[PDB]
Amino acid sequence: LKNQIRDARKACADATLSQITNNIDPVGRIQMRTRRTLRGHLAKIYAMHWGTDSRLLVSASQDGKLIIWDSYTTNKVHAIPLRSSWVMTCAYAPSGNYVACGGLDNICSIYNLKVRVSRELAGHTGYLSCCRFLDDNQIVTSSGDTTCALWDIETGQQTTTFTGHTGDVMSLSLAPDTRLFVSGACDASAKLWDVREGMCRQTFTGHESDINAICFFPNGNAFATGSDDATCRLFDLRADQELMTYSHDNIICGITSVSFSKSGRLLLAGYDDFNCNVWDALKADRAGVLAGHDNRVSCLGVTDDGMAVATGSWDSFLKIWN
Amino acid sequence: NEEKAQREANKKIEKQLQKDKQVYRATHRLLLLGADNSGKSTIVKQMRGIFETKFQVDKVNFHMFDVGGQRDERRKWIQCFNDVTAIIFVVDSSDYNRLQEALNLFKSIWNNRWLRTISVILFLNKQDLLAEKVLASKIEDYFPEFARYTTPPGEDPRVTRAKYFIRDEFLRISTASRHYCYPHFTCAVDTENARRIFNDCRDIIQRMHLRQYELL
């Protein structure tokens, strides 16, 4: 049965992306310098997320703290103490009214900044890996019990549950159209979900180990993933096949995060070797590197404006590059 | 104008962060691990989602966490505990059919990339049951190498031989590769485990400081 799908995908292999892209001009050397440094967290930082204004952002640390920063001045706006130390994720509402976090308590807490909790979304049977607002009314989460769910904050009950992964789901990302989203789990597979139908439209494979990060292409027609096999791969929704892979024989450490730039030309990845690399999304060549962290980098983020990039590490510091 | 208020708020936040740092530094975090056969809950009952237990010995505050609300697979959430002061390992030494699984888990923990610097306090629990069983299974049927063993206890050298063989089984893999293991025998009614943990943490921190201060 699956061999029919394999043959169908093979039949569409007209030419590799490398052959088509052999003519486009090179990006050239990319050198970036640190502009800011944010300090104050006691323990390792685990996650962060930019706001829509491209000025404010939030970060979570496993000492039991949430902090909101003003990137321009580096001043601390809010410092929120948590109830469970081992937070693992956090997100920022598109309108800036709300901020959410979650971790090993199997609870997703939402805070109102207009600071105290406003809603606790209990019901998951495993630790929370990621969460992302769709609006002030709805949010999407992924859990270590291999399920993703969509919540209604006002009622605080699940509306739909997405199932089909066999291992823990580690990452997810929302399409720009807000009508679709993808996730990756610890089974070397990524799936495309429809928020309204609540069913799996497509499935993708090609990695060898657990997938740790995933992100949507700016156009909404592609995405990338990073896994413990120390490689990154790009997929196309229409072709239903892998387009390009970014790997080098000198690196044997897994990836922790991935992100795109404004025009989708640069793909940025965070590695366990205490460094981040810059890839040419088309030519598939390593164009630059960011160094300066003294421990494994755990998160990444490119501002919606595209003017800057932020990174976090287990060294307990956040840095802004431009 | 508003910048003055912003800087004042930043200073107010920093004043509280500095105070919280001190209380954070004065408490040591421990992770409790083991299978359901072991009476690891009986250890914390002698001091008293994620369960927690707080006890104080010699004016030092200890905080121990028992994570038991997740699936069987643990290669992903175990990483969160990379900075604990020590790991407490509890084994039911009487049930021979589980010793191999315990050894496999111990070896997996000992060689993990993100755990290569955490010392382990090893508890061999339920000694009375072991003595009763041996004084009567034969141990050899599960570990054939036992028949060649010789000791390096109240009325039988046999029980000493068996218990020390079990202990050496762990020490052999412990000494095969910065961090150290501390074995202890313990019964189900031992009111000294807090003292043992206190002394072991003292030794661990002293050893770390000896290099932190460039004294080698």
């Epitope: 089974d187 180990s209 413990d228 044997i252 | 699936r71 069987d72 697979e73 496999n104 990339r113």
Partner: nanobody
Framework: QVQLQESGLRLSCAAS????????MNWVRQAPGKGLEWVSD????????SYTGSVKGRFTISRDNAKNTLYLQMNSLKPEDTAVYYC???????????????????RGQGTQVTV
């Protein structure tokens, strides 16, 4: 996709979808009415090998990286050996935690051996 297919005494385990030479390998058994148990494992190059005590001196593991195949040699079988045998892979490519878990993504469907 990563695939493992066992057959078969000399058991065989063919592998595909990944570089077989990078990962450590294991054998797992499940006797009727009991949970999974660890049997043996072989390092990446085969220079290190280990067995459970109950089968020491009675079984024999081997691997052939030139064709991505894994073997197990069994003799002097006892009635207690009747079980379903699984071919498992360690999670990471250069380091083995969850091979015995009830659900595991990198082990095969198993083969039946009845004495």
């Amino acid at each position: 996709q990563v695939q493992l297919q066992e057959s078969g005494l000399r058991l065989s385990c063919a592998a595909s979808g990944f570089t077989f030479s990078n990962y450590k390998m294991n054998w797992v058994r499940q006797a009727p009415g009991k949970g999974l148990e660890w049997v043996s494992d072989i390092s990446q190059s085969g220079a290190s090998i280990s067995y459970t005590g109950s089968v020491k001196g009675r079984f024999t593991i081997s691997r052939d990286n030139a064709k991505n195949t894994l073997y197990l040699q069994m003799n002097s079988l006892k009635p207690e050996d009747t079980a379903v045998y699984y071919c498992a892979r360690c999670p990471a490519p250069f380091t083995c935690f969850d091979v015995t878990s009830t659900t595991y993504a990198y082990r095969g469907q198993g083969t039946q051996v009845t004495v």
